[PDB]
Amino acid sequence: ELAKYGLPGVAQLRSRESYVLSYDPRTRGALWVLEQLRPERLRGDGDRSACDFREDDSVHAYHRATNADYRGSGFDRGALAAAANHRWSQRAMDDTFYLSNVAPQVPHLNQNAWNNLERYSRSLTRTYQNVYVCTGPLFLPRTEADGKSYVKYQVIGKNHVAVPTHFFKVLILEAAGGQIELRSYVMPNAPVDETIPLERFLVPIESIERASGLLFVPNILARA
Amino acid sequence: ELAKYGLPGVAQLRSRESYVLSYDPRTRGALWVLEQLRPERLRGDGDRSACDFREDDSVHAYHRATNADYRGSGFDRGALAAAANHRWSQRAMDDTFYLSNVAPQVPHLNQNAWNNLERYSRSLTRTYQNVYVCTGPLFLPRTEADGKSYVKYQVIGKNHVAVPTHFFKVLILEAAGGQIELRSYVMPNAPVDETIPLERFLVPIESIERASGLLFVPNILARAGNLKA
Amino acid sequence: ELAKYGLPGVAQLRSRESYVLSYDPRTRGALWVLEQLRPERLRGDGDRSACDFREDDSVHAYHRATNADYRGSGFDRGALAAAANHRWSQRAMDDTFYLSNVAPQVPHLNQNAWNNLERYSRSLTRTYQNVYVCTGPLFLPRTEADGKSYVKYQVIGKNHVAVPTHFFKVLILEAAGGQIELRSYVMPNAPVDETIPLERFLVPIESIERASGLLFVPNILARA
Amino acid sequence: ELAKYGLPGVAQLRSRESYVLSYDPRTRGALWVLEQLRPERLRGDGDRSACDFREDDSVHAYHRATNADYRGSGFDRGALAAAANHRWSQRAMDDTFYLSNVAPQVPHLNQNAWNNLERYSRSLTRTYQNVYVCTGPLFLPRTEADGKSYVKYQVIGKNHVAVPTHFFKVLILEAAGGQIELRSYVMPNAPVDETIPLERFLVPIESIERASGLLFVPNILARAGNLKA
DNA sequence: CCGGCGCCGG
DNA sequence: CCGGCGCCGG
Ligand SMILES: [Cl-]
Ligand SMILES: [Cl-]
Ligand SMILES: [Cl-]
Ligand SMILES: [Cl-]
Ligand SMILES: [Cl-]
Ligand SMILES: [Cl-]
Ligand SMILES: [Mg+2]
Ligand SMILES: [Mg+2]
Ligand SMILES: [Mg+2]
Ligand SMILES: [Mg+2]
């Protein structure tokens, strides 16, 4: 009866045709998005205007990002589950344009290195039976003049949509043979030199797990 | 086939003798703690030193606050479910010294105006049929000199435990019939003059809902009718 | 292959018609003996001369007590599983006269208080469906002038038969209803006033478990 | 129906990486430890401080020796399976610092003549096909002024850990064909002049068997023919 | 053989 | 959610 008036809401999972997502109403962004990439889901007629994002009415208005929040902010609507990953079905690609699957992203990053990383991810489907992609924001602390560590990020728009300090991407590469291989990257939410090799943004999965509060490694060895 | 190898981050609920909490591994802090204050439960022989907190090993070490994180930080280990709310059962009281029921709190606040809000909450068990207390942190943005808004909060210890900018306490009060009276408070994580009446810190529940990402009103209203104070 | 030449021998259990026993070849006595007492096993024709003990040829001669070891020592051959507990079968009472079921016992104790304790044990079978009796020696330390603790006991005979410093008896009273009740006693191997109430020699089972190296309480709660 | 509620005291064997032991809960000490010394296993990078023993929690607390028992006792924690017999594998070597492989040993003995007997044992792995070492304590009676014999040994610590009066080491040596050569030693738990040749401490195996309650000869002879030294 | 403590840890 | 450490403990 300690829950007579329910519980103040907990982890909001959303199942879309092309990804699953854990929403953070506090930041008005996804904590993570999970895609399962295969070669056939990568081809097809699916298309959409680059700027055609719509708000997620399944998120309460108190905690829902809107297009107006992005207006004049200088940030792209960076999709986490990328639209080109889901050309196989117009509905499946449409679902990537919900704002709940986007985060404020510095435009030079969205167009260049972060895009490059997505291209790379799709290429690994020629070698791997399944490329699971888990994408999400990070908010990483910094030490200031006073010796103290602070998390500092801008919030944009009326609804204070959090602007991540970095993005992570975890590739869970499922071999046809059953070997699972992990490649995880972090890039700062900042203009990133298009010519730095993607490999140099690799980080140990554990540094990502530590910062994000997510765990993949115990979940992977559930059936490994 | 999309979750065949698990999901990275699920609802981190914890049911204790004295409260229910939802835990946030990114902040290493609860999102909210829920108690039902009964007057029966307010008196008893439960006691524990003020400085005797335990890390919560039910949280993976990567996201678990430890006592080393607080040491030398300048912050009190501020319990969200208050110790003195559960004196009837020592186990009930010990549960409040799990660090997952704690957040860095400015000591003058923890020991004064936040303490006074707790004592006032216990007082309402005398005058209402049920007192529910939902307590939690806030991280509220501020507008800076360039005109832009930013959330800025300190993190302490090797585990980067987040220092809240504010705290909220929502009282769900059961009047005689089926009337629920809501009463919500915000205090800044800062020295708060003890002499300011607690009613000066009331806020519309909606602002706590908006800022916290939590929802109280639709949950309560599926259970009669409401009188926001 | 770390056991190519076997193992230097380990815990010697013996199953007799009337008790089971764990033998200690180091002391040439039983570590414990276990009887299961019931009212019908207490009646019958079984009899034997009080002094008619025979040595246990199932024990190696190096570690086997003999009658000659007892000769002139001033100690009775105290039976642990008591002969009167097993009148129902001559073989079953005979088995109690193996020296492996005896220990050197001060005679005034064997005749009086220790005997009284055995009488008491048999009486509890009118109330309890099973009276399990576990009997054995203790060797308890003493502090001397130098502040140090020492175990000191005489050994008798050519074969150095250890003379216990005390005896324990644990009664495991099995109710018909399933309640198990424990009564455990310790008496010093010394002349004991026949008129002290048996209750005053009760001790917590744990003090017996600690000294002896036996455990009953975890074994009792195996099926309790 | 006679063991329907269990037996109070069974064989307390322990299999470790580096030895097999039989444990005695009354004495809180091993009855014997059995190793097979291979030369391969004698060299490696295994190391551990001389003072870094662990209590063996596989033994019930009521009968388990702890480091507090040895502290201030004046006795070395004397390992029976020697550390330097298992340098190939750190886990193998760490197993010898379980206190259930230890007995109170007079320091001058542990660090000198008993050490020399161990080094000599390792030396025999060069000259024999297999070296088996069985090591253990003794509690040997003494005749007193009243003409009667008594075993008297100190017990140390709150757990009353028994100080042996002597120690035995039995070497089972595999000669070229199938010949086993037996070689058994006794030293008193006391300062032993390091200069006395180790052969002066040989004894007939039978005396160790008689005193210890252990049997070696019939076990070996079910495996060819024997040459007692 | 279990259980615990505070602390560390994947 | 498990695992560990030394120490305590039934
Ligand atoms: Cl898809
Ligand atoms: Cl919502
Ligand atoms: Cl810090
Ligand atoms: Cl019988
Ligand atoms: Cl034997
Ligand atoms: Cl001592
Ligand atoms: Mg993009
Ligand atoms: Mg407080
Ligand atoms: Mg008798
Ligand atoms: Mg040594």
Q: Are C196 and C190 in contact (CB under 8 A)?
A: no
Q: If you write DSSP's letter for every residue of D131-149 in order, what string do you get?
A: EEEEEEEE---EE-TTS-E
Distance CA(D190)–CA(D196), nearest Å, equals 14
Q: Does A177 touch chain B (CB under 8 A)?
A: no
3-state secondary structure (DSSP) of residue D84: helix
Q: How buried is residue D178: exposed, middle or buried, by Cβ count under 10 Å (0-12/13-18/19+)?
A: exposed
Instruction: Report the relative pairing of strands D149-156 and D161-162 from DSSP bridges.
Output: antiparallel
Q: Which of residues 63-82 of B touch strand E (CB under 7 A)?
A: 64, 66-68
Q: Which of residues 17-46 of B touch strand E (CB under 7 A)?
A: none
Distance CA(C179)–CA(A195), nearest Å, equals 80
For residue D208, the chain C residue with the least C-alpha distance is C62
Q: Which two tokens stand for residue A52?
A: 């055609």
Q: Which nucleotides of F are covered by protein (CB under 7 A)?
A: 1-3, 5-10
Answer whether any strand E atom is within 7 A of the Cβ of B57.
yes
Q: Are B28 and B21 in contact (CB under 8 A)?
A: no
Helix (H) or strand (E) holding D14, with range, is strand D12-15
* 3-class SS letters over chain C: CCCCCCCCCCCEEEEECCEEEEEECCCCEEEEEEEEECCHHHCCCCCCCCCCCECCCCCCHHHCCCHHHHCCCCCEEEECCCHHHHCCCHHHHHHCCEHHHEEEECHHHHHCHHHHHHHHHHHHHHCCCEEEEEEEEECCCEECCCCCEEEEEEEECCCCEECCCEEEEEEEEECCCCCEEEEEEEEECCCCCCCCCHHHHECCHHHHHHHHCCCCHHHHHHHC
Q: How buried is residue C4: exposed, middle or buried, by Cβ count under 10 Å (0-12/13-18/19+)?
A: middle
Q: Are C31 and C10 in contact (CB under 8 A)?
A: no
CA D222 from chain centre, in angstroms, equals 23
Distance CA(D202)–CA(D105), nearest Å, equals 20
Q: Are D205 and D216 in contact (CB under 8 A)?
A: yes
Q: Which two tokens stand for residue A111?
A: 């167009």
3-state secondary structure (DSSP) of residue B158: coil
3-state secondary structure (DSSP) of residue B152: strand
Single out the residue of D141, C203, B136 nearest to residue A7, CA to CA. B136
CA A59 to each of CA A134, B31, B165, B213: distance values in angstroms, whole numbers, following the listed order: 21, 18, 25, 11
Cβ atoms within 10 Å of B202's Cβ, excluding its own: 13
Please note each residue after which chain C is broken, C-to-N distance over 2.5 A, or write none.
Answer: none
Q: Are C105 and C197 in contact (CB under 8 A)?
A: no
Distance CA(B89)–CA(B40), nearest Å, equals 11
How far away is chain D from the Cα of C113, in angstroms, using its nearest Cα?
25
Single out the residue of B48, B40, B51, B42 nearest to residue B90, CA to CA. B48
Q: Are D111 and D121 in contact (CB under 8 A)?
A: no
Strands (E), chain B: 12-15, 20-24, 29-37, 76-79, 102-105, 130-138, 142-143, 149-156, 161-162, 166-174, 180-188, 226-228
Q: Are A171 and A179 in contact (CB under 8 A)?
A: no
Resolution (A): 2.3
End-to-end CA distance of chain C: 40
What subunits make at least 3 CB pairs under 8 angstroms with D?
C
Single out the residue of B171, B174, B20 nearest to residue B92, CA to CA. B20
Q: Which residues of B touch A215 (CB under 8 A)?
A: 8-9, 60, 62
How far away is chain A from the Cα of B46, in angstroms, using its nearest Cα?
21
Within 8 A by CB and 6+ apart from C44, the residues are: C87, C88, C89
Q: For residue D44, give the DSSP letter.
A: S
Nucleotide nearest to D158 (CA to C1'): F8
Q: Which two tokens stand for residue B193?
A: 């003059």
For residue A37, the chain B residue with the least C-alpha distance is B2
List the beta bridge partners of residue C77: C104
List the beta bridge partners of residue A131: A37, A173
How far away is chain B from the Cα of A52, in angstroms, using its nearest Cα?
26
3-state secondary structure (DSSP) of residue D37: strand
> Which parts of the protein come within 7 Å of strand F, by CB position?
A 218; B 57-61; C 206, 217-218; D 52, 54-55, 57, 60-62, 64, 66-68
Sequence-distant contacts of C204-210: CB under 8 A, at least 24 apart: C205/C170, C206/D62, C208/C138, C208/C168, C208/C170, C208/C184, C209/D62, C210/D62, C210/D63
Single out the residue of A78, A76, A70, A212 nearest to residue A155, CA to CA. A70
3-state secondary structure (DSSP) of residue D79: strand
Instruction: Report the relative pairing of strands D166-174 and D180-188 from DSSP bridges.
Output: antiparallel
Q: Which amino acid is at B185?
A: Y
Distance CA(B28)–CA(B31), nearest Å, equals 9
Backbone angles phi, psi at D111, to 5 degrees: -90, 0
Instruction: Report the relative pairing of strands D180-188 and D226-228 from DSSP bridges.
Output: parallel
CA of B55 to C1' of E7 (A): 9
3-state secondary structure (DSSP) of residue B156: strand
A1, A7, A33, A38, best to mutate vs chain B, most B CBs in 10 Å: A7
3-state secondary structure (DSSP) of residue B34: strand
Query: Do residue A5 and residue B149 have CB atoms under 8 angstroms apart?
Result: no
CA A114 from chain centre, in angstroms, equals 11
- What separation in Å is there between the alpha carbon of D194 and the centre of ligand 10? 14
In chain D, what's the furthest Cα-to-Cα distance?
60
Q: Which amino acid is at B55?
A: E
Q: Which of D150, D162, D210 sits opposite C153 (nearest CB)?
A: D150
Single out the residue of C31, B88, A61, B184 nearest to residue D8, CA to CA. C31
What subunits make at least 3 CB pairs under 8 angstroms with C?
D
Q: Does C36 touch chain D (CB under 8 A)?
A: yes
Q: For residue B12, give the DSSP letter.
A: E
Query: Do residue D8 and residue C34 have CB atoms under 8 angstroms apart?
Result: yes
Distance CA(C38)–CA(C68), nearest Å, equals 34
Single out the residue of B82, B65, B105 nearest to residue B18, CA to CA. B82
Count Cβ neighbours within 10 Å for each residue of D184-207 and write b for 16 or more, e otherwise: bbbbbbeebeeeeebeebeeebee
Q: Which amino acid is at A10?
A: V
Count Cβ neighbours within 10 Å for each residue of D87-116 and write b for 16 or more, e otherwise: bbeeebbbbbbbbbbbbbbbeebbebbbeb
3-state secondary structure (DSSP) of residue D59: coil
Distance CA(A139)–CA(B53), nearest Å, equals 28
Cβ atoms within 10 Å of B23's Cβ, excluding its own: 23
How far away is chain D from the Cα of C195, in angstroms, using its nearest Cα?
31
For residue B222, the chain A residue with the least C-alpha distance is A5
- What separation in Å is there between the alpha carbon of C132 and the centre of ligand 8? 57
CA of D101 to C1' of F5 (A): 20
Sign of CA dihedral C39, C44, C50, C53: negative
Rg of chain D over Cα atoms, rounded to whole angstroms, equals 18
Q: For residue D93, give the DSSP letter.
A: H
Within 8 A by CB and 6+ apart from B154, the residues are: A148, A149, A150, A151, B104, B162, B163
Q: For residue D54, give the DSSP letter.
A: B
Q: Which of C9, C150, C180 sits opposite D153 (nearest CB)?
A: C150
Query: Do residue C213 and residue D148 have CB atoms under 8 angstroms apart?
Result: no
Distance CA(A163)–CA(A160), nearest Å, equals 9
- Residue written as token pair 């607390």: D61
Which ligand approaches the C-alpha of residue C101 most closely? 9
Within 8 A by CB and 6+ apart from A87, the residues are: A41, A42, A43, A44, A45, A46, A47, A93
Which ligand approaches the C-alpha of residue D112 most closely? 10
Cβ atoms within 10 Å of C25's Cβ, excluding its own: 20
Method: X-ray
Distance CA(A111)–CA(A105), nearest Å, equals 10
- Residue written as token pair 């449409």: A94
In chain C, what's the furthest Cα-to-Cα distance?
59
Rg of chain B over Cα atoms, rounded to whole angstroms, equals 18
Q: How buried is residue C148: exposed, middle or buried, by Cβ count under 10 Å (0-12/13-18/19+)?
A: middle
Helix (H) or strand (E) holding D173, with range, is strand D166-174
Q: Are A131 and A124 in contact (CB under 8 A)?
A: yes
CA D207 to each of CA C217, D117, D211, D215: distance values in angstroms, whole numbers, following the listed order: 38, 19, 6, 10
Distance CA(D149)–CA(A146), nearest Å, equals 79
Sign of CA dihedral D4, D10, D11, D15: positive
3-state secondary structure (DSSP) of residue B169: strand
Query: Do residue A210 and residue B1 have CB atoms under 8 angstroms apart?
Result: no
Q: Which of A8, A36, A149 sits opposite B155 (nearest CB)?
A: A149
How far away is chain B from the Cα of A149, in angstroms, using its nearest Cα?
6
CA of B221 to C1' of E7 (A): 45
- Residue written as token pair 């799709």: A122
Q: Are B103 and B29 in contact (CB under 8 A)?
A: yes
Nucleotide nearest to C206 (CA to C1'): F10
Size of interface C-D (CB pairs under 8 A): 160
CA of D56 to C1' of F7 (A): 11
- What separation in Å is there between the alpha carbon of A112 and the centre of ligand 7? 9
3-state secondary structure (DSSP) of residue B83: helix
C26, C59, C130, C206, best to mutate vs chain D, most D CBs in 10 Å: C26
In chain A, what's the furthest Cα-to-Cα distance?
59
Helix (H) or strand (E) holding B208, with range, is helix B205-212
* 3-class SS letters over A39-76: CHHHCCCCCCCCCCCECCCCCCHHHCCCHHHHCCCCCE
Q: Which of D26, D152, D223 sits opposite C213 (nearest CB)?
A: D26
Query: Do residue D36 and residue C1 have CB atoms under 8 angstroms apart?
Result: yes
Q: Which two tokens stand for residue B170?
A: 């929502």
3-state secondary structure (DSSP) of residue B101: helix
Q: For residue B125, give the DSSP letter.
A: T
Q: If you write DSSP's letter for every residue of chain A in order, what string do you get?
A: -TTTT--S---EEEEETTEEEEEETTTTEEEEEEEEE-SGGG-SS----TT--B--TTS-GGG---HHHHTTSS-EEEESS-GGGGTT-HHHHHHTTBGGGEEEE-HHHHHTHHHHHHHHHHHGGGT-SEEEEEEEEE---EE-TTS-EEEEEEEETTTTEE--SEEEEEEEEE-TTS-EEEEEEEEESS---TTS-GGGGB--HHHHHHHHS---HHHHGGG-
Q: Are C192 and C173 in contact (CB under 8 A)?
A: no
Distance CA(A53)–CA(A65), nearest Å, equals 11
Cβ atoms within 10 Å of B146's Cβ, excluding its own: 7
Q: Are B164 and B188 in contact (CB under 8 A)?
A: no
Q: Are A31 and A22 in contact (CB under 8 A)?
A: yes
Answer whether any strand E atom is within 7 A of the Cβ of A218.
yes
3-state secondary structure (DSSP) of residue D76: strand
CA of D67 to C1' of F5 (A): 15
Q: If you write DSSP's letter for every residue of D100-169 in order, what string do you get?
A: GGEEEE-HHHHTTHHHHHHHHHHHTTTTSSEEEEEEEEE---EE-TTS-EEEEEEEETTTTEE--SEEEE
Distance CA(B151)–CA(B160), nearest Å, equals 16
Single out the residue of D182, D179, D189 nearest to residue D225, CA to CA. D179
List the beta bridge partners of residue C137: C167
Q: Which amino acid is at D120?
A: Y
Structural domains of chain A in order of their starting residue, each with its CATH number: 12-221 (3.40.570.10)
List the beta bridge partners of residue C180: C174
Count of residues making up chain D: 229
Q: Which two tokens stand for residue D93?
A: 């070597």
Answer whether any strand E atom is within 7 A of the Cβ of B48.
no
Q: Which nucleotides of E are covered by protein (CB under 7 A)?
A: 1-3, 5-10
Single out the residue of D77, D55, D80 nearest to residue D66, CA to CA. D55
3-state secondary structure (DSSP) of residue B159: coil
CA of D46 to C1' of F6 (A): 21
Nucleotide nearest to D66 (CA to C1'): F7
Q: How buried is residue C161: exposed, middle or buried, by Cβ count under 10 Å (0-12/13-18/19+)?
A: buried
CA A124 from chain centre, in angstroms, equals 18
Q: For residue D80, give the DSSP letter.
A: S
- Residue written as token pair 């291979």: D38
